Every structure is written in structure tokens, then in C-alpha cells.
Design a protein around this ligand. Structure first.
Ligand SMILES: *[C@@H]1O[C@H](CO)[C@@H](O[C@@H]2O[C@H](CO)[C@@H](O[C@@H]3O[C@H](CO)[C@@H](O)[C@H](O[C@H]4O[C@H](CO)[C@@H](O)[C@H](O)[C@@H]4O)[C@@H]3O)[C@H](O)[C@H]2NC(C)=O)[C@H](O)[C@H]1NC(C)=O
Ligand SMILES: C=CC1=C(C)/C(=C/c2[nH]c(/C=C3N=C(/C=C4\NC(=O)C(C)=C4C=C)C(C)=C\3CCC(=O)O)c(CCC(=O)O)c2C)NC1=O
Ligand SMILES: *[C@@H]1O[C@H](CO)[C@@H](O[C@@H]2O[C@H](CO)[C@@H](O)[C@H](O)[C@H]2NC(C)=O)[C@H](O)[C@H]1NC(C)=O
Ligand SMILES: *[C@@H]1O[C@H](CO)[C@@H](O[C@@H]2O[C@H](CO)[C@@H](O)[C@H](O)[C@H]2NC(C)=O)[C@H](O)[C@H]1NC(C)=O
Ligand SMILES: *[C@@H]1O[C@H](CO)[C@@H](O[C@@H]2O[C@H](CO)[C@@H](O)[C@H](O)[C@H]2NC(C)=O)[C@H](O)[C@H]1NC(C)=O
Ligand SMILES: *[C@@H]1O[C@H](CO)[C@@H](O)[C@H](O)[C@H]1NC(C)=O
Ligand SMILES: *[C@@H]1O[C@H](CO)[C@@H](O)[C@H](O)[C@H]1NC(C)=O
Ligand SMILES: *[C@@H]1O[C@H](CO)[C@@H](O)[C@H](O)[C@H]1NC(C)=O
Ligand SMILES: *[C@@H]1O[C@H](CO)[C@@H](O)[C@H](O)[C@H]1NC(C)=O
Ligand SMILES: *[C@@H]1O[C@H](CO)[C@@H](O)[C@H](O)[C@H]1NC(C)=O
Ligand SMILES: *[C@@H]1O[C@H](CO)[C@@H](O)[C@H](O)[C@H]1NC(C)=O
Ligand SMILES: *[C@@H]1O[C@H](CO)[C@@H](O)[C@H](O)[C@H]1NC(C)=O
Ligand SMILES: *[C@@H]1O[C@H](CO)[C@@H](O)[C@H](O)[C@H]1NC(C)=O
Lengths: 48, 467, 144, 48, 48
């Protein structure tokens, strides 16, 4: 249960991006600028 | 001048030419270093000056040289670096005058076989346009002849990086007889970084300067010239910070085993080794044999350009793209490339090339870029976000501007929706401004007496494909 | 090549004629800013373990030792505890490093003495608790 | 911002934290406007 | 500091003389674009 709860709670980490929310990154930036932040979030969540 | 013959040998470099690759004070560590080093047990040429034999020749510089002299009476005074060592090019003159070490980047008319006659220098007849003249160190070195055997070895490594000549130095006591076998000392003697001389020159050849007696006879000395190659080395750092051992990882399988690990001591066993033995030495360039140059004069020097709302697209094919041709005629105020680097354009071949040409205002050139917002980007010409190509612009007031004013260029001020990338709208229609109806196309007024933000600019956008 | 200078005078072939490789700037006072002359000064910096030659206009502060403080020595910032050092260190070099690239010693620019840099609270500290809903007292173990 | 196109020609439109192409789809909770006059060569200094 | 405004009038020492810390812009109509006056509007956004 603790491992599952930790995996859920790690979704609120920025991992060096401007936000932990994907929708904010998509809606605030164009494709080229948002690709970097989405790649950072993807790398962090894949590591988790 | 000096009609005496020469005498060159061919000895092994053994374990010489080790220098400090950086400036950090490290301790008790085995560090792998990659770069230009003298390989272990390589060919090195030995030039001898005893038995009255003058052995000075213009050795190539390459990617750096290793210089080591073995003498007793300070015979080797300095060096001359350059390309042709003539007065059509600039050369470096680094030497000792007996009281200082002087470097003179300078344009020399060198004497044939430049040499010192005792303390009197007889290197150059004249010097001009001479961009460097200062002293690096105040050391004393007389021209008196010392009898006996060879006493010390002075080793040098000359490297070029960022237009600067880096000199690494180490002196070791080494007793060698006059008639003994010519060989280098054993062990590791690290060369400390001495000077960084901002010569700002291209060096391909170098020549050694010695000094003769008043009767112009050579003294007893010897110098060795080796060439640095691209190698990977591991250095053992002492607890005090000095370098005490070295391994050339491309020498033998044992050195490759030591370099695969990070230790100078290997235990008994079988070890899988990474590849250090073989490196590429030649480059095989193979381009298609097209010889035509691309019609840059047809597009860049056209009498009239298209308007930005009706931009013209042209396909470029079966030609060589040489942008250095345009340097003498067109001065580009904007050369920005996306997806590729502009310095790499001369080494690339493109499967498809398009050319989009139009005229905008001076302050609207910034809108010709991915992810831009403005009248031109929204309603006239939009680049894709994943744009691969280069944007070329230059000020054109001698062609598209006049004293009375040029009014042949148009731009779209309004659309019902923003343009998609590489979409062109040339339809004529009106739009409602309040209650009146006005044309959606506005006119550029290009007067010859105006600021650069209102001056007409010709923009050429190139699109590339790499398939 | 980078930082390379070529001042030689020579001509090159343009088709069949030979023209000089040096072209002349015409700097008229009545011209646009794209043709106006511009003076460019390029500064090149180096940040090594060497004595400082050129530095900024920042005022110094008196030394504070045996305390956890922020420090700034020759532009090398950090945070730690400063203590008097018996380390003997090579001349024309400033700071001492580690195998983990941690700055443990630094030469003072004014008093010319080496000082240790010890990280703040480098020892292990363990807290023994009977537990919340049992007590609020704790016991502290300062390891080694 | 398309209203200003027929009157004001912007020599500088640089956005930070958001994309300029995304400005027509965003709603802001607070907007401030700072106005001044500088030289032509000092416009580059108005940046982080 | 960021977004800090100082409108106080004071003088400062240049060598031994005291000169005003406020300097005047000379905006002539016949000048280059680097000396032409530019009107800068800075917008600040919040997305809370
Ligand atoms: C590619 O071509 C298609 C087909 O021509 C084109 O679609 C058209 O798009 C426009 C712009 O979005 C549409 O017009 C809008 O339609 C509705 C009602 O008709 C409203 O949303 C809009 O009215 C507002 O805007 C008007 C001014 O634009 C105002 O007068 C009005 O008061 C409102 O504020 C607007 O009229 C149009 O209906 C379609 N047409 C069709 C046939 O679908 C599309 O935009 C083109 N795509 C491009 C160029 O990328
Ligand atoms: C021309 C290059 C040249 C270099 C790189 C050079 C470097 C150099 N020479 C030194 C000393 C010395 N080295 C030499 C002589 C030489 N050293 C040489 O490498 C050569 C080629 C000569 C002879 C021309 C002598 C005699 C001294 C002692 C000088 C003194 O008392 O300071 C020292 C040690 C200084 C010290 O211990 O205080 C350095 C760093 N000197 C030079 O003359
Ligand atoms: C530039 O465009 C703006 C925006 O459409 C125009 O401003 C409108 O002008 C009409 C006609 O006078 C008025 O009824 C509207 O109230 C105005 N709207 C706003 C938001 O100001 C403006 O007139 C145009 N300028 C021109 C064509 O020179
Ligand atoms: C600018 O350089 C180009 C390219 O070298 C020159 O164009 C050549 O001109 C010569 C005659 O001067 C012709 O024989 C060649 O065929 C041209 N070559 C190409 C590739 O166009 C051009 O003349 C130069 N312009 C100058 C010096 O004003
Ligand atoms: C611009 O500022 C500099 C630096 O403060 C001034 O130069 C000083 O001028 C005073 C006399 O006014 C001299 O005593 C100082 O020695 C100068 N210092 C330096 C570092 O040069 C300069 O005068 C000012 N120029 C003006 C106000 O026009
Ligand atoms: C370099 O020295 C080696 C030593 O064995 C010799 O065989 C080889 O021929 C030498 N190379 C040249 C170019 O003299
Ligand atoms: C340059 O060298 C040439 C020989 O290459 C010589 O004839 C000429 O006089 C020299 N010019 C000088 C020193 O100005
Ligand atoms: C010959 O050498 C002497 C001294 O060694 C020097 O002064 C002279 O210039 C040289 N000759 C020529 C033609 O350069
Ligand atoms: C080089 O020397 C020649 C002849 O003295 C002179 O005309 C020219 O201006 C010089 N060039 C430089 C860059 O000093
Ligand atoms: C370099 O400077 C020295 C000392 O001022 C001077 O004697 C010498 O002629 C100069 N060398 C040149 C200009 O080649
Ligand atoms: C390090 O330097 C000290 C001080 O000179 C010397 O006593 C010691 O022997 C040196 N250590 C080694 C391993 O060379
Ligand atoms: C531009 O190139 C054309 C090519 O036909 C040529 O006629 C013309 O002289 C060039 N220069 C100008 C200033 O138009
Ligand atoms: C200034 O620096 C010197 C060394 O250059 C040093 O001896 C001295 O203590 C420093 N401080 C003062 C206040 O003179």
C-alpha cells in the first residue's frame, strides 16, 4: 500500500519542469517549448 | 652560410612526452585522459650536433610536437613557428637572448638557416606588421661552451588550442656520454604547463634555432622531435599532486587491460577489454559529382520581389549551394538556421530544397521564425514549429526603396483565421471595421529617407529535407 | 580557426581576373544603422586555480571562523565552517579539492593563509522517541 | 492584440513563461502594464 | 531589485564634483534607430 501511495504521490513532482501538470504546460506553451518540459516529466515519471 | 652536413637518427620515444592535461590539483587518483599525446615506443627522429654536424630542418608541426634537447652548453636557443617561414606570412619567433625569453609574432624576412653567432643574433634581416613583442621569463643562459659529457635533458610539448601556443616544460638531470648510444631516458617525467602565448596564428611547420661559435662551428648537442597523435592515456597522480606513472592504452594488450580498469596493478585473471587499439586515420569523403552552382543570382538579385501575402516559392535542385559566393555582393543582416547548424551547411547534401521570397518591413524580420506572433506571422507567412531550414534577410533600399517612395508591396492586415504553416492566401476581399468596409490588404510605403525599422528587407526562406 | 588572425596580403582569382582579398569599408555619416560602423570589444575569461588578476568591485568582509557561514573567496562561493589549517599547498594556486570535487581548503586572498572548509553538521544525528501519543521527550545520539 | 495591428507596428514582441501564439487561448487572473521610454539600443535590456 | 522603482532626486560624487544622478534623453527626429525613442510596454501575468 505504501509503495502504491508513493507512486501516486510522485505525480506531483516537476522533475525540473515548469509545472507538474501536463495541461498547464500544453496550454501555456507552443509545441517546441512544451516538448522540453513534457520530455522532462516523461523522464521523471518513467524513472518513478 | 653553414655548408656542413646533417645527421639524423631514428630512436624510440620510450615513455617520454607526458604532460599535465589540465590545471586541477588532483591527488591519489588514476585519471583517464584523451587528447594529443606522444605515443609510447614510437618513432622519434634524433638530430645530433656533435662531431660538427648541423642538423636543422623544417619539421612539420601536425597536431603538436614533442621537443627534447640533450646538451651541456645551452646550444638550442629557441624555435621559429609558422607555415612558410617567409615574408609573405606571419611567423612566431620564440627564443632566448641570454637574459630573457622573448616571443615575437612578427613578419620576418628570415636569413637562410637562421642561427645565432655567439651572443650576436642573426635571425632576420627585417621585421614589420609585428603583432606581439614581450618577454615571458627572465632567465639567464650564457653562450659559453662547457666541456665534458651531456648533463641535462630539457623536454618540451608545443600545442595549439584556441589560437594560443601552449608550452609544457620539464628539465631532468641525464648524464649521457659523447660517443654513447643515442637513447632517451627511462621513467615518467611529467611536463608542467609553462606558458600560453596568444599568437593567433596557423602553424604547420617549425624550425629550431641553435647557436654556433665565433668561427661558425656547431657545438656538441642533440635534439629530438616527436609528433603527438590522438591517444587515450591514464596518469597516476601522487599524494603530493605530481604525476608518477603513465599508461598508453593503445600500446599493448596489457595496457589495454589496465585502461579497461582504472588500476596500474592487475591481478591474476581474464579480463574483457574495451577497444583502444585501433583508431581511424583517414577520412573518405564521397559526394555526388554535380558541378553547377545554385542560381543565387536569380533569386537574390531579382529586380522585383513578391509581396509577403503572395510570397513566391521556388524549387532548387541539381546544384551546389555555395553561400560564400554571395559574400562580395550581398550582406546578410539575418542568417538564422533551424534544425541544422549554419556552420555545417557546407558538409550537407539535401534531398529537397525550396526557396520562399518576399519583402517585409525592417521591424517585421523577427516575425519570420517559428512560434512568432504578429501581422506577418498570423496573416501573411507562417513557418512550422518543426521548421528545418534557414532564414536569410538583407536590407534592400537601393532596389526596393526610392526618394518618392515605393508602393508596389502589400501585406494582409486581417483574416478570419490565422494562417496554417506554409499556407498562402492571395484572395482579394474586404472586412468590416466598425460599420465601414476596408480592404484587407495594406500598402507598404518604402521611402529612401527612413529608419532601418521602416526600410524594406528582402527575406529568402530556405526549407530542407534529409531523407 | 577560432582566435586565428590572418593579416597577409594576397590576391585571389575571380573568374579569370585577380582581385585583392581585402575589401574596404565605406563609413558615411549619413547612412542606416546596418551600415554604421560599430566598435566591438570581445573579452575572454579564464576561471582556474590561479591567483586572481582581474576581479569585480565587491567589498570584502572580516573573517568569521568556527561558524557555519556563507563564504566568497576569489569568486568561489560556498557554505561551510572555516577553521585554521596546517595544510601546505602549492604556490600560485588557491583552493584545495577532494576526490568528490568538494572544496575542503582555500587560501585567503588578504592574510595569505589556508583555511579548512568543513560542511555544516557533517556528523550523523539520531533521535530516539518513545512515540507520539506516549510522550514528547526525546533522546539524541550524536554518532561517532 | 490583433486590434493593434493596423495602427501599432511592434518591433519587439517577446513573451516569457508563456508562448505568444498561445495568448489568444489563455485567461489571466492578474494583468499589470508597465510603460516607459528608453533609447533604441536599450530595448534589449528589458529582459530577465 | 525586480519591479522596484526609485524616483527620489539626489546627487552623487564624480571625483570631487557632485552631479545629478538623472540624465536627460535627447530625442532628435534626425537620428539613427539606436538613438530613436522607443515606447516599451511590459505585461505581467498570473495564472492562479
Ligand atoms: C479554410 O477555409 C474554410 C472555408 O472557407 C474556412 O472556414 C471559415 O472560417 C471562418 C473563420 O472561422 C468562419 O467564419 C466564422 O463563422 C461563425 C459564424 O459564421 C463565427 O464563429 C464567426 O463570426 C465571428 O467573426 C466574424 C468575423 O470573422 C464577425 O463578423 C462575427 O460577428 C463573429 O464575431 C465567423 O464568421 C466560416 O464560417 C468558415 N467557413 C466555412 C465554409 O466553414 C477556414 O477558416 C479556412 N482555414 C484557414 C484559412 O486556416
Ligand atoms: C628558450 C626556452 C626557454 C624556456 C622554456 C625556459 C624555461 C625555464 N628555464 C629555467 C631555467 C634555466 N634553464 C636554462 C636554460 C635553458 N632552458 C631551456 O629550456 C633552454 C632552451 C635553455 C637555454 C637557452 C638555464 C641556464 C636556466 C637557469 C636560469 C636562472 O638562473 O634563472 C626555468 C626555471 C626557472 C627557475 O627555476 O627559477 C624555466 C621555467 N628557459 C629558456 O631559455
Ligand atoms: C484599426 O482597427 C480597429 C479595430 O477594429 C478600429 O477600431 C474600431 O473602429 C471603428 C470605426 O471607427 C469603431 O466603431 C470601433 O469602435 C473601433 N474599435 C476599437 C476596439 O477601437 C480602428 O478604427 C482601425 N483603424 C484604422 C482602420 O485606421
Ligand atoms: C563576386 O564573386 C562571384 C563568384 O566568384 C563573381 O562571379 C564570377 O564573375 C566572373 C567575372 O568576374 C565570372 O567569370 C564567373 O563566371 C562568375 N562566377 C559565378 C559563380 O557567378 C562575381 O563577379 C564577383 N563580383 C564582384 C567581384 O564584384
Ligand atoms: C563618467 O564617470 C567616470 C567614472 O566615475 C568619471 O571619471 C572620473 O572623473 C573624475 C573627474 O570628474 C576623475 O577625478 C576620476 O579620476 C575619474 N575616474 C575614472 C575611473 O575615470 C567621468 O568623469 C564621468 N564623465 C562625465 C560625468 O562626463
Ligand atoms: C621508426 O623506428 C622504428 C624502430 O623499429 C623503425 O623500424 C621504423 O622504420 C622507423 N620509421 C621511420 C619512418 O624511420
Ligand atoms: C620578401 O622576400 C622575397 C623573397 O621571397 C625578397 O625578394 C623580398 O625582397 C622580400 N621583401 C621584403 C623583405 O620586403
Ligand atoms: C649568414 O649568417 C650570418 C651570421 O651567421 C648572418 O649575419 C647573415 O645574414 C647570413 N647570410 C644571409 C645571406 O642571410
Ligand atoms: C603590412 O605591411 C605593409 C607594408 O609595410 C603595409 O602596407 C600594410 O598596411 C601592413 N599591414 C598591416 C595589417 O599592418
Ligand atoms: C621587440 O622589442 C624589442 C625591445 O623593445 C626591440 O629591440 C625589438 O626590435 C623588437 N622586435 C621587433 C619589432 O621585431
Ligand atoms: C611530498 O612532499 C613532501 C614535502 O616536500 C616530501 O617530504 C614527501 O616525500 C613528498 N612525498 C612523495 C611521495 O614524494
Ligand atoms: C543583380 O543581378 C542581376 C542579374 O541579372 C544583374 O543584372 C545586376 O546588375 C545585379 N545588381 C543590381 C544592383 O541590380
Ligand atoms: C593586502 O594584500 C597583501 C598582499 O598583497 C597582504 O600582505 C595584506 O595583508 C593585505 N591587506 C592589507 C590591509 O594591506
Amino acid at each position: 500500500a505504501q509503495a502504491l501511495n508513493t507512486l501516486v504521490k510522485q505525480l506531483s513532482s516537476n522533475f525540473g519542469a515548469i509545472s507538474s501538470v501536463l495541461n498547464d504546460i500544453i496550454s501555456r506553451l507552443d509545441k517546441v517549448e512544451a516538448e522540453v518540459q513534457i520530455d522532462r516529466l516523461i523522464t521523471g515519471r518513467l524513472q518513478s | 652560410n653553414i655548408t656542413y652536413g646533417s645527421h639524423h637518427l631514428y630512436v624510440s620515444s620510450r615513455t617520454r612526452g607526458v604532460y599535465y592535461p589540465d590545471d586541477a590539483f588532483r591527488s591519489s587518483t588514476n585519471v583517464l585522459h584523451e587528447g594529443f599525446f606522444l605515443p609510447f615506443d614510437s618513432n622519434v627522429t634524433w638530430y645530433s650536433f656533435w662531431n660538427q654536424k648541423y642538423s636543422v630542418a623544417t619539421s612539420p608541426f601536425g597536431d603538436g610536437v614533442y621537443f627534447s634537447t640533450i646538451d651541456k652548453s645551452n646550444v638550442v636557443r629557441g624555435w621559429v613557428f609558422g607555415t612558410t617561414l617567409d615574408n609573405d606570412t606571419q611567423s612566431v619567433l620564440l627564443y632566448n637572448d641570454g637574459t630573457h625569453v622573448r616571443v615575437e609574432v612578427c613578419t620576418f624576412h628570415f636569413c637562410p638557416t637562421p642561427v645565432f653567432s655567439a651572443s650576436s643574433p642573426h635571425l632576420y634581416s627585417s621585421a614589420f606588421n609585428c603583432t606581439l613583442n614581450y618577454t615571458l621569463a627572465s632567465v639567464r643562459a650564457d653562450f659559453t661552451e662547457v666541456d665534458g659529457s651531456f648533463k641535462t635533458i630539457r623536454e618540451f610539448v608545443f600545442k595549439l588550442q584556441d589560437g594560443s601556443l601552449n608550452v609544457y616544460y620539464a628539465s631532468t638531470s641525464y648524464v649521457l656520454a659523447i660517443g654513447a648510444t643515442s637513447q632517451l631516458p627511462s621513467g615518467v617525467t611529467p611536463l608542467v604547463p609553462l606558458w600560453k602565448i596568444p599568437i593567433g596564428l596557423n602553424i604547420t611547420n617549425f624550425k629550431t634555432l641553435v647557436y654556433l661559435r665565433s668561427d661558425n662551428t656547431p657545438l656538441q648537442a642533440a635534439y629530438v622531435v616527436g609528433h603527438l597523435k590522438r591517444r587515450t592515456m591514464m596518469f597516476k597522480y601522487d599524494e603530493n599532486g605530481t604525476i608518477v606513472d603513465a599508461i598508453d592504452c593503445a600500446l599493448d594488450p596489457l595496457s589495454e587491460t589496465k585502461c579497461t580498469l582504472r588500476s596500474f596493478i592487475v591481478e591474476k585473471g581474464i579480463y574483457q577489454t574495451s577497444n583502444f587499439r585501433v583508431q581511424p586515420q583517414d577520412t573518405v569523403v564521397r559526394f555526388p559529382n554535380i558541378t553547377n552552382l545554385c542560381p543565387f543570382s536569380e533569386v537574390f538579385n531579382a529586380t522585383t520581389f513578391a509581396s509577403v501575402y503572395a510570397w513566391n516559392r521556388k524549387r532548387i535542385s541539381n546544384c551546389v549551394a555555395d553561400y560564400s559566393v554571395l559574400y562580395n555582393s550581398t550582406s546578410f543582416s539575418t542568417f538564422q538556421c533551424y534544425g541544422v547548424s549554419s556552420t555545417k551547411l557546407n558538409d550537407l547534401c539535401f534531398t529537397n530544397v525550396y526557396a520562399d521570397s518576399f519583402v517585409v518591413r525592417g521591424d517585421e524580420v523577427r516575425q519570420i521564425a517559428p512560434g512568432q506572433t504578429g501581422v506577418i506571422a498570423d496573416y501573411n507567412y507562417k513557418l512550422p514549429d518543426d521548421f528545418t531550414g534557414c532564414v536569410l534577410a538583407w536590407n534592400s533600399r537601393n532596389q526596393d526603396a526610392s526618394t518618392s517612395g515605393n508602393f508596389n508591396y502589400y501585406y494582409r492586415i486581417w483574416r478570419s483565421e490565422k494562417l496554417r504553416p506554409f499556407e498562402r492566401d492571395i484572395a482579394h476581399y474586404d472586412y468590416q471595421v466598425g460599420t465601414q468596409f476596408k480592404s484587407s490588404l495594406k500598402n507598404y510605403g518604402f521611402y529612401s529617407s527612413a529608419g532601418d525599422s521602416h526600410q524594406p528587407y528582402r527575406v529568402v526562406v530556405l526549407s530542407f529535407e534529409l531523407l | 580557426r577560432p582566435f586565428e588572425r590572418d593579416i597577409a596580403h594576397y590576391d585571389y582569382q575571380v573568374g579569370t581576373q585577380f582581385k585583392s582579398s581585402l575589401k574596404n569599408y565605406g563609413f558615411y555619416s549619413s547612412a542606416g544603422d546596418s551600415h554604421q560602423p560599430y566598435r566591438v570589444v570581445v573579452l575572454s575569461f579564464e576561471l582556474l586555480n590561479a591567483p586572481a588578476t582581474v576581479c569585480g568591485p565587491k567589498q570584502s568582509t572580516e573573517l568569521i571562523k568556527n561558524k557555519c557561514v556563507n563564504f566568497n573567496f576569489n569568486g568561489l562561493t560556498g557554505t561551510g565552517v572555516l577553521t585554521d589549517s596546517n595544510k601546505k599547498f602549492q604556490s600560485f594556486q588557491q583552493f584545495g579539492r577532494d576526490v568528490s570535487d568538494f572544496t575542503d581548503s582555500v587560501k585567503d586572498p588578504k592574510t595569505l593563509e589556508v583555511l579548512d572548509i568543513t560542511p555544516c553538521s557533517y556528523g550523523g544525528v539520531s533521535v530516539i522517541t518513545p512515540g507520539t501519543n506516549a510522550s514528547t521527550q526525546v533522546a539524541v545520539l550524536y554518532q561517532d
